[PDB]
Design a protein around this ligand. Structure first.
Ligand code: NAP
Ligand code: TOP
Ligand code: ARG
Length: 158
């Protein structure tokens, strides 16, 4: 079972200058509670953006050139990245945009964070067909001190 997990502000924007333009601690905490204790696959750009291994998670990184970090696994094809993860209930594609474009067909589950926000961005979440996806869960939170914008977690299922 392969899952994508992301945070999309309006017009499906996911990043700007190899960052996420928002800082929502409750999103980074959602992301953790779900990804924790399971393989995470990511692109090199995103590995740099994060720029540290995520504890708990076996970190697996997609790049066509040799690895520059010994404490994470490095891989060159989609299948190599899957095999890396092992025999597990659930895999977690944690980004970025070019990775999501490739891992959606094999995906059976989405974890979106819908963000009530208008940001400029260079990177977009793919265009998922709201037919082939069934919303199995939703949860809206208001803007608070730390969480500058309102947001809503959604899980979908193929
Ligand atoms: N919550 C969110 O919305 C979220 C989560 C993650 C990412 N982001 C944002 O998304 C953006 C990432 O943009 P991006 O799409 O350029 O990042 P990316 O997906 O991290 O970068 C993909 C890179 O991974 C490698 N790669 C991917 N598939 C490969 C394959 N099949 N074979 C070989 N190498 C492969 C390539 O690196 P090589 O050049 O080394 O070959 C490729 O350039 C950033 O702005 C980031 O902040 C935000
Ligand atoms: C733990 O920190 C990061 C996590 C992520 C991945 C990620 C984070 N949140 C959500 N909802 N989906 C994701 N795929 C992406 C990041 O930068 C692009 C991070 O650095 C702040
Ligand atoms: N919007 C929905 N309720 N879709 C139903 C799920 C469709 C399913 N993913 C096919 O295959």
């Amino acid at each position: 079972m392969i899952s994508l997990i992301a945070a999309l502000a309006v017009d499906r924007v996911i990043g700007m200058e190899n960052a996420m333009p928002w800082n929502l601690p409750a999103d980074l905490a959602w992301f953790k509670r779900n990804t924790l204790n399971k393989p995470v696959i990511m692109g090199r750009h995103t590995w740099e953006s994060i720029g540290r291994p995520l504890p708990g998670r076996k970190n697996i990184i997609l790049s066509s050139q040799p690895g520059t970090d010994d404490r994470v696994t490095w891989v060159k094809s989609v299948d190599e990245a899957i095999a890396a993860c092992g025999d597990v209930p659930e895999i977690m594609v944690i980004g970025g945009g070019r990775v999501y474009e490739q891992f959606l067909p094999k995906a059976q589950k989405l974890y979106l964070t819908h963000i009530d926000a208008e940001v400029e961005g260079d990177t977009h979440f793919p265009d998922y067909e709201p037919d082939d996806w069934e919303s199995v869960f939703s949860e809206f939170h208001d803007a608070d001190a730390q969480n500058s914008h309102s947001y809503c977690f959604e899980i979908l299922e193929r």
